[PDB]
Amino acid sequence: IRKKLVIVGDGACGKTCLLIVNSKDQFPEVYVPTVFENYVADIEVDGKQVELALWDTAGQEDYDRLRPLSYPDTDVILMCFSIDSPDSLENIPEKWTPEVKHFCPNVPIILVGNKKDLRNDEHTRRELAKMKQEPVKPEEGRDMANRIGAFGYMECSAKTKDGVREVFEMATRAALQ
Amino acid sequence: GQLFGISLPNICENDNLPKPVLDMLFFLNQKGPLTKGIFRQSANVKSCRELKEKLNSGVEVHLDCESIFVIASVLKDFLRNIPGSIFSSDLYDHWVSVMDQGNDEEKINTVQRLLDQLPRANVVLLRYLFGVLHNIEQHSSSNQMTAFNLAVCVAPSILWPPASSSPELENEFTKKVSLLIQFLIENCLRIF
Numbered sequence A: 001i002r003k004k005l006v007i008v009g010d011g012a013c014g015k016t017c018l019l020i021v022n023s024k025d026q027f028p029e030v031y032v033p034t035v036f037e038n039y040v041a042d043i044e045v046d047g048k049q050v051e052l053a054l055w056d057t058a059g060q061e062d063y064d065r066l067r068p069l070s071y072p073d074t075d076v077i078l079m080c081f082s083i084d085s086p087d088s089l090e091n092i093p094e095k096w097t098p099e100v101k102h103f104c105p106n107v108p109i110i111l112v113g114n115k116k117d118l119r120n121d122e123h124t125r126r127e128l129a130k131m132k133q134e135p136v137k138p139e140e141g142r143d144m145a146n147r148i149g150a151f152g153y154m155e156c157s158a159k160t161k162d163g164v165r166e167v168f169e170m171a172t173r174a175a176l177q
Numbered sequence B: 001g002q003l004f005g006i007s008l009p010n011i012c013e014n015d016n017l018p019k020p021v022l023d024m025l026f027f028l029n030q031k032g033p034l035t036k037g038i039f040r041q042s043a044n045v046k047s048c049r050e051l052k053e054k055l056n057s058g059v060e061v062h063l064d065c066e067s068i069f070v071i072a073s074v075l076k077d078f079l080r081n082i083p084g085s086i087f088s089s090d091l092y093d094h095w096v097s098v099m100d101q102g103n104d105e106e107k108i109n110t111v112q113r114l115l116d117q118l119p120r121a122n123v124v125l126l127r128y129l130f131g132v133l134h135n136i137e138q139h140s141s142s143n144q145m146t147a148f149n150l151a152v153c154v155a156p157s158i159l160w161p162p163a164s165s166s167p168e169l170e171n172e173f174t175k176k177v178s179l180l181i182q183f184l185i186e187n188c189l190r191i192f
C-alpha cells in the first residue's frame, strides 16, 4: 500500500530533522536548508504494511513557485511550526493553510509543533521575552488545529525523539482514511 | 509612489537606487552577519505584508525597529517582483551553464560578460547585494549561513526562467542556480 506525505511549514522550523529521525533514527548535525528531497518510510499500522513516500520541501517564500510540484496526489500533509517561534505559528493561518487548502483540497492536515524541548529552554525564553513573546503553549497549538480544521495536533522533538513515532503513526492513519 | 513590481531603470532616476532599498541593504550589512539563520528563518508574514504596504505607499518607515528577518524577507520579495528578475530570464540558459566553464577565471569571465548585458541599475544593486552576502558568509561560523546556505535561500529571488516555462524547468536547474550563486557570493570581489 503506497501513500504520499508532504511536509510543509516555515524555513528552519525542523521539517528535515523530523523526517530523518523518523527514518534514519539519528539527529542530523548539519545546518543546511532543503530545496526538495524524497524519502521512504515503511510503517505498519492497523495490520497494514504501508510504503509512505515522504516529500520534503523548502519553507522559504522564495520557493513558492516550485512547492506546488510536490502537491499532486498527496494523501496527508504535515503542517509544521516551531514551539520556540510564535511567528511560525502565526504563519500557519496566514500562509500555509491558504496554500495547502488551495493545492490539497480535502487532504487531511496534521498540525505539528516541532522543537518541543525548547519550550522551557532558558535561552529561548529570554530571547522571546526580549521581543514581548513566549514559546507556543499546548492550548495555542490545539486552538490553531481546530481553527484550520486539522485531523490532529501533535507536539514532538526530533532532538529528544519525543512524539516522533506518534506523528507518523497518526499521519499514516489519516492517509488510510 | 509604488516601489514593487517595476523594472529598476523605471524606479531609479539616473540609476540611483531607491532609498528604502538602500536602507534595507545597509541594515542587513550591519545586523545580518550577527544574526543566526538570516535569509533562511522565515519572518512573520503579517509583519512583511505591513512593511511592504508602507514602502509601496511611500510612507514613513523606521527600519532600525523592524525585525532583521522581516527586512531580509521584504528585500527578497522586492527582488522577486522585478519583472524578468534582476539576472534577466532572457539569459537563463547562459546563467545555468556558467558552472560548466573550465576553471575559476573562465567562469568569472563568462559571468562578467553576462553582467555587461544587464541594465546598469541592476548591476549597481547586485554589487551592493552580493557584497552584503559576502560579509554575512564571512561570519558563517557564527551565523551558520555559509555561501551555499545563503545561495539556496536567495537564488529563486534572483533568477528564474522565462514566464512561458513550466515550474518543472525551474526545478530542473534550481540546484545549478544555487551552485552558481554560491560561486558569485564567494568570488564577488573578483567579479564586480
Ligand SMILES: Nc1nc2c(ncn2[C@@H]2O[C@H](COP(=O)(O)OP(=O)(O)O)[C@@H](O)[C@H]2O)c(=O)[nH]1
Residues within 6 Å of the ligand: A010, A011, A012, A013, A014, A015, A016, A017, A018, A028, A030, A031, A032, A033, A034, A059, A114, A115, A116, A117, A118, A156, A157, A158, A159, A160
Ligand atoms: N532544539 C531543537 N532543535 C531542532 C529540532 N529540530 C530541528 N532543530 C534545529 O532546527 C534547525 C533547522 O532544522 P531543519 O530540520 O533543517 O529545518 P527545516 O528548514 O524545517 O527542514 C537546525 O539547527 C536543527 O538542528 C528539535 O527538535 N529541537
Ligand SMILES: [Mg+2]
Residues within 6 Å of the ligand: A015, A016, A017, A032, A033, A034, A056, A057
Ligand atoms: Mg529542510
